[PDB]
Symmetry: C3
Subunit: 264 residues, 3 copies
């Protein structure tokens, strides 16, 4: 769990997950394992304690939110032809984001606090939460498509919850980066605040939300039988993602190599 800085507030049942406590700021296998590990642990305690409508905040201790998938790993596994290991990584990432999407199995309120740039998997992670709070500037998008890498952490599924299937498709293929304000007008982020005011915004959401715990839980039950993204669906999409990733040529791999270096 060295990759995470955890702050737990049992009294009010608010829990903070800070990524990149070990520090590129990406979803390394260690970070993914640490996140899923904590999600499972926290979810178990919440269930066992019978807590109603807990809040879980996803944040970052880095100057960026999260740069997405572990491109260095992708290049290694693709060049080695290790589909099995790549698929496993993808599935673990999906379990992570889906957990936020369904409230860790504890009907929790997941809040993404984006105070830096969120690219690829990073943007997907934010979209997996119930509420997205971003500061100015910040920059969010899936530019990885520009070297022909299909987004692999539920971008389409999560976006369709907020926008049309067609627009979601356009955004995913275009490879553009959007400002927090642009995303707000697009309905992809919920609140935009000045720099350094992110945490304050999160507290506002919590305070307002904590006044309707049963209503929240009920809403979550309804989502579960209606609009919720099925984990089984996301897994079938990971098969598509891995198959496409494994077909990346050296041009793409080399570009990914250069990106890692520039960011690292």
């Amino acid at each position: 769990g060295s990759t995470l800085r955890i702050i737990e507030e049992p009294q009010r049942d608010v829990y903070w997950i800070h990524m990149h406590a070990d520090l590129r700021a990406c979803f390394s296998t260690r970070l993914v394992d640490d996140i899923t590990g904590y999600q499972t642990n926290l979810g178990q305690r919440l269930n066992t304690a019978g807590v109603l409508a807990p809040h879980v905040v996803l944040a970052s201790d880095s100057d960026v939110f999260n740069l997405g998938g572990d491109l260095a790993l992708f290049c290694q596994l693709i060049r080695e032809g290790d589909r099995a290991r790549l698929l496993d990584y993808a599935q673990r990432c999906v379990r992570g984001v889906h957990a936020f999407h369904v409230g860790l199995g504890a009907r929790a309120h997941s809040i993404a606090l984006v105070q830096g740039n969120a690219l690829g998997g990073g943007f997907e992670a934010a979209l997996s939460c119930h509420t997205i709070i971003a500061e100015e500037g910040v920059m969010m998008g899936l530019p990885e498509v520009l070297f022909d890498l299909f987004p692999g952490m539920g971008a389409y599924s999560f976006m369709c919850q907020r926008i049309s299937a067609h627009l979601a498709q356009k955004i995913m293929l275009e490879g553009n980066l959007y400002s927090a304000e642009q995303l707000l007008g697009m309905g992809l982020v919920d609140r935009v605040v000045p720099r350094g005011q992110g945490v304050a915004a999160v507290e506002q959401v919590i305070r307002e939300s904590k006044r309707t715990p049963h209503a929240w839980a009920a809403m979550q039950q309804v989502r579960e039988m209606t609009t919720a993204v099925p984990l089984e669906e996301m897994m079938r999409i990971t098969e598509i993602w891995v198959d496409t990733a494994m077909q990346l040529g050296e041009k793409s791999l080399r570009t990914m190599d250069r990106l890692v270096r520039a960011q690292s």
Copy 2:
């Protein structure tokens, strides 16, 4: 006794005016009102089918200074304090049958039109959303403020998702805000907004337009049935969720509901 019905078999237009019995009490969905509405719906629907009338029109309106204040809070408090889940569930199921009937045109592929000339809160707002066309007069306020005392909203979510994103629908349902007709129009939650006292004229305009394309309307309804229509069974599973949550309302929520009844 709770309804003032005006039938025009000449042009197959049927007006349902709620709250005819008050002409003194609370303008809400009392058990009697719900029974009266569902009873008439079933009767009219069967009559229309037997007569084979194509694309009839049914208008939901109110004779009170408000459209409808929603669920019978006075009843809820009684049943909740008595622990009578059976009766509460039965009430909920009857309400769902009523709103779903409007949604599917009474089983006669009719055109449901909600004429909202007064405030529509909770169930009242949901009733309007269950119709195919919502006509509101300037100044009118609609919303689901009951969530503020932790009472989950019926078919609100189901109906809203027909007009807006699942994400936005969820946010609206949990915020507990009231919206003006003007705002609702820009949000896509109401279809037409006209000056006070012009509501009926607006309804007649919709009727005239629609009556000029009966076969096309019937076809559209057939398509809806095999695509986007909200399943009755789905709404009936949601009632289970609703009752389970309602039965857990604390004393403070009950007192708040008590006061609201008195005030209204």
Copy 3:
């Protein structure tokens, strides 16, 4: 099993896997005549087969028009003839053929192709639906689109299915029933079209979409696979809707039929 595919003017660029289909090369009114529909479906199958065999990744197919309008929709003259003769069989056959044509664009000819509709003239009824079936719609200023046929009680195919991909089910219904015509600008703000450009700049706009899109072939193919298992409109669904369409069409009254008669003459 290849076979012969003059209602179309085809321009193929295998050098870059781009293929242009220009409707109304034979030009009566610029609508979906039985001849045009057969020409389109025939070419779609031929090209699709070639693309599949070649294993080409993310080919582009452009639907355009050589007429001053994009497409006026269904063959009203044919409808009136069949309806008055009570020939449901032939009417249904026509509808199903149209559905196969539009669905093919929707699913990229079964070769994961990127379908682009270049609308430089009015697109009515089937014409508007045809554009909505594509993945990208590029329109020029001044162009009007809509489904005014509903006005004489003719139900719009897959218009509803295709619109629900871009807008709410509720708004789709209203647009489907109102019978209004919308400008390219209006459609853009509504999310029903993707880009609006000045007159005569349509082709340039298409080239721009293609040039940029060609940088992400594998990504496109993957997206199409996801669409297939999630939000793509099933051919089965459209076929069931054709039954509803024909049953309604066969019930058109004298007034409607006469209105259709005059429309054909006016447009012709």
